[model samples]
Target chain A: AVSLDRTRAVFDGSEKSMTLDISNDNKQLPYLAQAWIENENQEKIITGPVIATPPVQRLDPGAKSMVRLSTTPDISKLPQDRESLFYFNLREIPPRSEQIALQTKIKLFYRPAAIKTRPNEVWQDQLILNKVSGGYRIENPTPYYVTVIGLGGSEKQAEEGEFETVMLSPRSEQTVKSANYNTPYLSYINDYGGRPVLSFICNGSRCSVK
Target chain B: AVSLDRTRAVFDGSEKSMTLDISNDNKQLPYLAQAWIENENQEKIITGPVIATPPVQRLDPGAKSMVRLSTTPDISKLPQDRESLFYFNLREIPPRSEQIALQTKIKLFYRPAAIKTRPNEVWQDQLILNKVSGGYRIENPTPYYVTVIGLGGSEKQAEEGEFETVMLSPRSEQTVKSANYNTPYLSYINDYGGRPVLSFICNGSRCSVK
Candidate 1:
């Protein structure tokens, strides 16, 4: 009945607001499109840093619309050093029905203005891994959240293992089980959701992306 | 990294459990697939009537896995009349990353065992729309959520208007704004997400599916 243009939404701090494209595809019938923002935990924010405008609109069949997510002054309460996560929900309500109405919930990342580079450009290269008990302690020294996957001699050979994938929060560390590979390459999910591999240089117990 | 086989899940009360298929598409890397159930409000259930099994699993690239949603004895607490809604969340944790991990949240409908007829079979026909001030009072006398749309002389001509789409909860009533059409055909979202049109026959101020 209704659909969002993107699988996820990114609101850069540099911008005062972000616009999301939505459409009603019924072609013949119209739908009530509703949009809202929820905290990372999926709780509806009463008056949060972000607000969706025209929260409710009647989208005619084959009609296109935009929902703007604007940052409020309250955005100052959010951390300036790391990306904040929220959920963008768009629901389509039919004119009348006894059945369930479908809704879309996608990740929304608010990137602080201090960080100007694209997420895929340089963040993953700052990853550091050190040998730790039972596994490796992965460190994310960057401000952005990173998804790491694959461990192999090359990007294409990044095969599966016990700890083949792990997501490191900004400036946080996590221990993952050790794999058999000694000088394995690692991969991370880039802004486009593509996996880009990063080679590492090891010095005894420590390793850094090459 | 990970994807679900279905957009939504339906658990029939007559069944002891339902299985959902998941796959890791990395082809080279592995991912940790985590599954959990949340209430309709999106709150994680510490221990609820329904539970997902193999909550966490290592899905090797190109690996396929199944997550089972089983009903516990606590299910008796849920109403036995209408469908109960819950959320099924599947998060794909990369082997390692500083980037955000993606998660999928889809609607899960639990249909009580007593309702044997498929949702699209007989429910929509029972809908009743009574002419009311400024609009029509639509009644969903059946125990199923119904998405109603389209107001036109024919389903194909169901054009746009203020109250073209509305969702009626099981056995619930809602008033929709009036349109210019005297006898408008209505369409609804079916079990397969396809729109099925229903023509209504009117007698004075009341109408029923013809």
Candidate 2:
């Protein structure tokens, strides 16, 4: 009954608020779109620094609307050195129906002003992977979260589900089983949800983007 | 590494050309971004009615560019009453890398002027489903392709992979095994890739959106 404009949203700490476009695709009936924010743990926030204005909106058939995500004074309490992750949820309620309604959940990143970098900057280059016993230990040294969607000797092989997708948090590390690729390449999801591959040059046991 | 501005592309017959924005996210190295159009069968078109201009371009690190999709005079041979399906492919080649390049493939819809409907209009509502012996026979009577992503008693259940995703071509029908959901609901992917649910009211063996 309803749809969001983008697959994901990003809230720049330097801005007062950000808006998300929504539309009711049902051309015959009106739908009630409810928007909310949730923590990384998927817990709904009751009084968080970020709030969605007009939490509930009535969207007419073939009509378009927007949900404003504004930050409150409490935003100052959020960490400034790293990015905070959240989820933006949009649920559509039909006027009256026996069938279930649709709900959308997308990642919402809160980027602090302290991190003065463009949204599409190359932070994934800072990742380092070291070959370990059973697998490889991947380290994300940057202040941004990196979502690894593919890993293999070639991008085509990785995209063919040769390796599983993994998300690396800011300044964190994780281990994955070895996929046995001669020279492993990693693909990360960018701001637009595009998977861009980066080849790694291995020296001894340590590997970094080439 | 490159990313397209939008997830999909739409070519209106009334227009001369459509442009897709692309960006190079590698802030340290330049990359070559190549664009092409493929038929629904995934074969690259050599002398098709539609073509992508500047087939290859050098994108500086952190720079933005665009690929223009223009149609030739042969476009008039295409069916005007229905939508034609194609694929937009973008492949990113690193300046120097041992790893494979990343390629993006997204749907490209060719909408003729004769259709005369907004891109986000409600063509999905025209879908009809008739309960058969083992499953439901879904029919698409409209002139647009409908991508059904979810089907269940409730939206949550459908999103949980209770049903497999199916694509219904314009003016076509297909049968799927019954999941046995009481008053089953369906969700279709909109232009922005948002899944919007539509409830069905069944009368005997036939069902239509409520």
Candidate 3:
């Protein structure tokens, strides 16, 4: 089994170096990990400024290793003004006997040379929710993509536990099926590294959460 | 792309059968779906009364199919009063050329013949939080497995979004890493079908949210 500690990266000049910790949890199976970057078209971004280390490293069972990633000055010229959307991929290959190899990818945002405001705080302020048929309409009225977790309505479940998820691109809309909620619905907007996250409540069409 | 309309089941005596809609979106690839039930130990529960139809079926791109799952009287022997926990798995296999196959499993609860209170309401009332050495200690005093989504602290992330998750067994305790938070930390507890979920705020040892 392989696991990733984080889900994304936002490289803004001062923060060009990032590390990903990959672990092999199979008690006896060793894992080999390779790293790369890809674009929206599923094409590998070979010309981008981002580069990863340990392209292929073997790990013994129950062992853990880190993949160090750094970007070059070339990134700024590769759509560097705003956010150059890309994906950092970790392909983990086990022994030949292993039927399935694991491949994981997280979104990468290469930002401009300067950022006037960080996204975490701005995201919470611009969040909006509207009641839709059978559910709620969540809007990310911002320029930054906001990864969301823990989408829920106000109604208590009748049988089992459940939750919904979504990724809101800048100024995008997502519709989530919901039950009739008397109180505000709740969800989390992750900050960088998802630490110090923010929660928002959608009470009908009005969403105001701190 | 493929999706499951619901995430759980409540097989009471009266409602013996339910239909779940599964859809595939790949225009070029068809999908084959297979299903089964698994116990807590990841072992297939062959003796249980639950069964799924079209054990295997082919779906064309942009085509949708319905999976009807039914239960027999034998489920009573497995667990009488509490919920008998099992997993309902849907393994979607793509055309041989598609390379990747999808397998999804959701929680299935086999309820007893007699029912009193619903698990969702009870879950929120019994939730407790405590300050631990490095983070927070969360306790679920109820008798239902509480699935948790989204956990965060106070730091503003610089790179990508992140959050932690946990599942609390009935009357079980779990610890989550966190920074000391003066504001309430938020989380979601989903329900069967996962629509209309519930959220909680954890501040110190007390957790309360409307």
Candidate 4:
């Protein structure tokens, strides 16, 4: 053995993150691999249909073997935290029928983690997103204000750059700590005594803090 | 090819949660196939191991393959909302003990999803929260209190059964929002005001909230 005996990895969802300890060097290398991070289209992140062959790098006697594969990263490795809406430039509708706000849902799989030791060998399939959809009203030449209060009266606007945004993390039973979803989507006035911590002006695709 | 594919799972995490979707249907469903949801290592809620496996049935065709593995029924299936923390109990220590408190850190990452049909996977991962860690203190006695002052100027007491905790998303640029660990321990003060929430009354081994 090249200073090593064997390699082991229990393909179990045991830890938020696992360290692949290389036996030979007492070194732990980390790779940003996702097991299955998918979006609403049920689309998965794929490089291509290339087959995974044994890596040319030989495994040290005690070193672990290397393979190529793909998987969604752990939920912890999710792309953005809670907020799925992308950073796009918002624009108001032309007018009347031309002017309309559509309700949309952005869905993605829960855990986006790499399947195993393999680097590019992707999962044979994709996981459908549970769907985190919302609506954007393009009714302004300005930004749309957003607010979150799950922060318990400690409201803070969830924003990107300047616009207020949302951050979702469950705190109570089936309930998230602070939320902008605010239960029935599109309701003004929450528990934060009116002055919700989060606020931004959203106009169609983009939003900015006022 | 073998008609029967195999997948096994065990979840004892905070919510007994796991989600996965298989693309194809099985020709012969296995009877030995069963699912068990238990709180692994009941000693703690977050810091532990989850030996969860999905019962692999025969593959089905058409559409995409996805799964939702969960131990808890309360969590949302939306993948974007999955970057949640596995809450662990904090062991209480004497006022002057070296082990002042428990600290937990959460890190987020992104890898090109092996399943590429999904949208915005790459750009999302490339966005924020490569990794992050934070924590706070716990109360030591009865009538214990932790207070947090809003970024502005407000104070609130840690509420029980209510979510008083605040967390910064992984990509957050500010330290005030990037919270994952329970350092020394955590107290939800945002509920009372935006200050440091306090923990009071310890049972020698852990602190109680409910």
Candidate 5:
């Protein structure tokens, strides 16, 4: 059982994809499963299909056959300057147990209402107010407050929605970059197992982590 | 003219600063016309302090004066890193040439409150709307959206707020940031001289300026 339609985000020139359906009940022959893309320190920018395409054989022998793990989102190769918050996790590989059970999805991108754009009319939870800081900085001349989260995938939430924070003055220019909560942050935990992205670690001073 | 105190927002090691009455009439201190700190591409990171001290005369040309501006706060020269949503505009250089008139407070430090550290009401803003990005990669891992600026600062605003545009997908990189309503944001135009700050600009979709 693997399907896809809106696994998450697709906006940048656009073709939009998130498909992975499986039911191959007439299986003449086909079987494999594995996919990847994990950031938020988990690492593994892309690896969602070394082998996958087999499921279908349950129309009577017990009835259950279907397969289609299609993924068409290239993002060129990631890291060109991306991070307004993203996540795409869809897993299930058990023809012999390679381990997979991640179904997390957090994404965001609605700026193109046909180029007219500006329909953000607020109210995604007062526009991410819980903690605010989804991105955008200028070396801190000062005056900042923030908290923001998940964007609206888990369903619009902001008691401090998402964030970015920096407040320096003394001798300035360590270049941490009005600093948005952490350095380049080690490419997502170190690779594919945690997969699908995650990082909201302020954890104190009005702390958070859900 | 030239006054500042955006309202709140001053932590992350907030050393201390609060005093800017400026205008007790030293005949307006020769009209005291000129100051700077505009940065963020708008230009002017420091056009040479208009005057931090020196100007204590007034036999009663009209009477009124106060200008301190001192917040030593130095979190390693903060560039940003707690909840990052920011603003700060205080222009006066008026009363004469160079045409200036931006005097209305615009300060905010929403939640990552850190000065000697140790304060958490869930870390503020709804615990950042259930924050937890520590895994994935969207800059800080994604979650920021709030724009409130019907006008300039008296601070305390949140009749209601919330946001969600970038949820994570597109292999989960990140996006949900870009704030500049344009010319004080198309319309009232700061009454006329136009100068308002309360902005955010994330690059999950990559705006290209790091």
Candidate 6:
């Protein structure tokens, strides 16, 4: 078996091609391999030219292989200046004598080349915090996707385990229920899939630094 | 970081105590620990007398710690014959010099000691599969919770990652959507956390083994 070099991929629209390296860590030789891509909903994206090469291959122990991918279409057709998340999947084929198989999967990003800033940064900058009926609403004004992790009173104590992830598209909004209490907080995932230590606190329809 | 010896726990109501072993895998000795129990919504179960002893502790590398937990009510007061699921959590504090910490968690079940049949067996035996507005629904009549993973046409090809986990509550029903096509399928996580290789084909409102 092998481990993915990265947990995520950023696809700026400028580049027509992307590459992913898979390094086998097993002591023995490998079996034939296969790979594909899927959209955020786990539904296979039929279009957008998701081309992955060398779908089937075998590798020596500790050897590495690169899978090339490309989107052979206009950037305008896709969401402009936004990050569209997808999934890169690699299926491991068991040896002829083996009985089972497992696959490696990773998250991918389709980022417009024009957006110089990262998705989370854009999300944070354009985020509008306000009190709403039931709980609170976070508005995304920029043309980017905001992936928010759980919230916290401050940056240091953000919710981790069992925290629900919210992916808001550009110009869209999401609501987080306070249920019984009003503790304004905002936390998000970064490009490296890491949560920022800094959090935004809102007070009666207004957001400010804690 | 450390790992728990068990990913699941079975509490058949007869026992008043449950112990969990947490083995530290870090290079150095560990720090203070704290524990609690929460429900499926990640909300703390406030009503149940969920008692966990010695919530705080310290350990050395390669050492193990036993956590004892129990609910202080009669089995009849709780959901009967069914598996009332909860979560066992252990939050590990980093040493004073360390800047971060981690929490270990596992699924806990408060299964009333009376049910004789296994969860999956009962689920499969009493499962009602049929068409619905969008897809289909699986009605659970037994007094046990059945955790199901998505399934492919045959029993051998089970979809794990891209699929959703349907936790079928006892005596309750859940619906499943058939996105594009229909295929005979049967996949579930048994009481012992094992996947059963069986397929059920539904013709109209009746389901049968294929």
Go through the candidates in order and give each one's DockQ: 0.02, 0.03, 0.06, 0.02, 0.02, 0.05
Which candidate should be chosen as best, given lDDT against the real structure?
A: 2
CA-lDDT, candidates in order:
0.70, 0.75, 0.59, 0.23, 0.27, 0.59
Model 6's alpha-carbon lDDT is 0.59
TM per candidate comes to: 0.47, 0.52, 0.46, 0.18, 0.22, 0.51
Docking class of 6: incorrect
* lDDT string, candidate 1, B108-176, tens digits: 778889874655475787888787665578889888877675444334333221123566778899887
Higher-ranked by TM-score: 2 or 3:
2
**Descending-lDDT candidate ranking:** 2, 1, 6, 3, 5, 4
Q: Place model 1 in a CAPRI quality band.
A: incorrect
Q: Model 6: per-residue lDDT, tens digit, A1-210?
A: 544456556766778888888766666866555667787776565455555666677777667887877886644676666777777766665467741122445557787777756444534645766666654577887676666654543232243212334667767888865321123345665666555544454455756445
lDDT of 1 at A62: 90
Clashes of each: 31, 0, 9, 128, 138, 1
Q: Judged by DockQ relative to the true structure, which candidate is superior, 2 or 5?
A: 2
TM-score of chain A of each: 0.82, 0.93, 0.70, 0.17, 0.20, 0.80
TM-score of 3: 0.46
Judged by DockQ cut-offs, the docking class of candidate 5 is incorrect
Structure candidate 2, residue pairs in collision: none
Best by DockQ: 3
Q: Summarize candidate 2's per-residue lDDT along A1-210 as a digit string, tens digits.
A: 677776566788899898988888789999888888888987789677888878888999989999999898989898998888987877887787643222556678898999858746788988998887655799999888887766654454344332344678889999976534435678777776566888886776788887
Q: Could you tell me the fnat of model 6?
A: 0.00
Model 4: per-residue lDDT, tens digit, A131-176?
Answer: 1223232221211112232221111212100122232221211122
Q: Model 6: residues >4 Å from true position, as ranges?
A: A1-210, B39-48, B71-76, B99-102, B117-122, B154-157, B208-210
Off by over 4 Å in 5: A1-8, A11-103, A106-210, B1-89, B94-210
TM-score leader: 2
Q: Which residue pairs overlap in candidate 3's backbone?
A: A135-A178, A153-B197, A160-B192, A161-B190, A162-B190, A162-B191, A192-B157, A193-B160, A194-B162
